[PDB]
Design a protein around this ligand. Structure first.
Ligand SMILES: Nc1nc2c(ncn2[C@@H]2O[C@H](COP(=O)(O)OP(=O)(O)O)[C@@H](O)[C@H]2O)c(=O)[nH]1
Ligand SMILES: Nc1nc2c(ncn2[C@@H]2O[C@H](COP(=O)(O)OP(=O)(O)O)[C@@H](O)[C@H]2O)c(=O)[nH]1
Ligand code: ALF
Ligand code: ALF
Ligand SMILES: [Mg+2]
Ligand SMILES: [Mg+2]
Ligand code: NA
Ligand code: NA
Lengths: 340, 330
């Protein structure tokens, strides 16, 4: 559970408090948090980014096509590094609990291979995963295969159309935050992630550009012009990232060492020092945290109005008396908490 | 620029000159900033193409090599000769900017350049902008379609060798060059894959599987190359040092030593030279047939024989000339 992001203890406490408040005054819950979806070209580093957001390794990563089926991860808050209060469970394996996240990765691989073989095949049938933990939100993440241009192995001629439709079904909804993942060692104008995001989200009200592989850029080049909004501007801006390379994947490098390595990388290069606070996985997590806090606080006006109307009605109305006065006190406490 | 073992091989030029006494054009296709201009200029052997990150090439450049025995000429600047190739590069930049501004605009209107040298062939090369996905600057929403059509106009012809340029630091299945080449040349009988930026690949990864033909096979195969990075461009590094650097890179990397002879710009030049020689030797059947028929006709006439005198002379001269030509062929 990493502080200052989407698993922020403060944010989880806030959501739980507000949920209990609403469930103590007969008011339906309006908190409809968006799902976070990664979209981009093949091997652009989407699974790496998503697992970095989660904070524990559990997604299959590697060169070529690795993710070949949508993985719909369902974070589940559960009142109480193989922990016991935390685990994952698959829908196609009901009843089974996965406390070892390495076993979750292994099961994702096995389930994928069992349905799309081991020859680059693809399927839109999602792998549904629930992760229970007392330190997460009721949030939905989505990992997707990367878009390609030339088919390989069992792939049909229209593989691009299939992958594109598979992604569009997940990013077409207005309540979805699009992580458009682009490799930094590629010109930004070639980004499939930005292309698709702009296709669904032209106004950029829910698209975050994530520039991966910045440690693999040609010597003397940087992404500073993009961050400043000088090439292809994004309302929500860009975030550079340094995930684990292929050598690190083969060596099963832990996530913590990789995050420290990213921190050092951005603290040492002359082009990113002056803006190091705006670099790395932590800043992407902070952007997502701010967006979620925005979505929560945007529901405070109508809730205040509803509570005011209910209080006016109940006060005009006044075992029934005791319950009603308790409800009046509860409504006032609810208004107070909605204020803080 | 008179480099042996490529498209400017002196023996090949001598052969062409012998034969006279319709080569295909070479077109580069690939994603933006994939290194197409670098590959093309290395094939030619002299620096004269604008290079750099972002969008640099924004208009087709139709370079026409012309053999001449004792410089550059632009269509929009008639009469001016460019002996200094740096000025050729500057003029390409200026002419591009004169029609598409300086904000990434693009146009299919080509810049026509002729380079005369006694060490070149009568050949046509074409440099093109790279395909993109998102518009930039003044570019319209359909910039991708416009660039795609601009390229198709040049690679749809059957007499075109397609250098499909793919950066090696990108998965091959994302290659725009291969997609387009297969779109026009599905049988791959005239497509050569060129893998650039091999010096920027993630540690532990290589293109050994691609060269071996295990991912996306190409009849004519793949060639890895190491062009000048942006740091080299800024320092105006000469071509000789850059090519030596490519040679050393492939002579030292653990994955390519055992096959260094099949890597680099020299090997791509050798491939193109063999393709051109094939196209030349493909013109030998009809020439032999025509010479044989002409010889039969003239020999019949001579056997038959003031007009008779100056016709017998003509026929004997034509017989000698046809025999000399038929021997040149052999
Ligand atoms: N060096 C480096 N390699 C990266 C980075 N991000 C991704 N990669 C590599 O990119 C390849 C594909 O990564 P992955 O996360 O599986 O991409 P996906 O196919 O889009 O899910 C792997 O070899 C990763 O090591 C990065 O920031 N730096
Ligand atoms: N290090 C390195 N950089 C390369 C290589 N090939 C291309 N580049 C860089 O890629 C960028 C764009 O190159 P360019 O030839 O102009 O590509 P074009 O837009 O397709 O014509 C420049 O910064 C080049 O230095 C290569 O093999 N190695
Ligand atoms: F393995 Al991928 F996009 F190439 F998840
Ligand atoms: F400058 Al380019 F393809 F990006 F020639
Ligand atoms: Mg993946
Ligand atoms: Mg170019
Ligand atoms: Na991949
Ligand atoms: Na470029």
């Amino acid at each position: 559970a990493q502080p200052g992001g989407i698993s922020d203890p403060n944010l989880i406490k806030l959501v739980n408090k507000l949920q209990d408040v609403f469930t103590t005054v007969g008011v339906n819950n309006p908190i409809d948090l968006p799902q976070i979806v990664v979209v981009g070209s093949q091997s652009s580093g989407k699974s790496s980014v998503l697992e970095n957001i989660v904070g524990r390794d559990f997604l299959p990563r590697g060169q070529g096509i690795v993710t070949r089926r949508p993985l719909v991860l369902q974070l589940i808050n559960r009142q109480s590094a193989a922990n016991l209060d935390e685990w994952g469970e698959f829908l196609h394996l009901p009843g089974q609990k996965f406390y070892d996240f390495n076993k979750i990765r292994d099961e994702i691989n096995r389930e994928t291979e069992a349905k799309v073989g081991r020859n680059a095949g693809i399927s839109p049938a999602p792998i549904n995963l629930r992760i229970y933990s007392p330190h997460v939100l009721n949030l939905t993440l989505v990992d997707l295969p990367g878009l390609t241009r030339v088919p390989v192995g069992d792939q049909p001629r229209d593989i691009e159309r299939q992958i594109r439709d598979m992604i569009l079904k997940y990013i077409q909804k207005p309540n979805a935050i699009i992580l458009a993942v682009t490799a930094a060692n590629v010109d930004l104008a070639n980004s499939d992630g930005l292309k698709l995001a702009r296709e669904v989200d032209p106004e950029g009200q829910r698209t975050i550009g994530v520039l991966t592989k910045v440690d693999l850029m040609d010597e003397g080049t940087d992404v500073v012009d993009i961050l400043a909004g000088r090439i292809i501007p994004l309302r929500l801006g860009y975030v550079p990232v340094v995930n684990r390379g292929q050598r690190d994947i083969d060596n099963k490098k832990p996530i913590t060492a990789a995050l420290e390595a990213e921190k050092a990388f951005f603290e040492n290069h002359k082009a990113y020092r002056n803006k190091s606070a705006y670099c790395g996985t932590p800043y992407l997590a902070r952007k997502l945290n701010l967006i979620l806090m925005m979505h929560i606080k945007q529901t405070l006006p109508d809730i205040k109005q509803r509570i005011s109307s209910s209080l006016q009605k109940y006060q005009q109305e006044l075992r029934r008396r005791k319950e009603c006065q308790q409800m009046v006190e509860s409504l006032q406490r609810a208004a107070e908490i909605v204020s803080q």
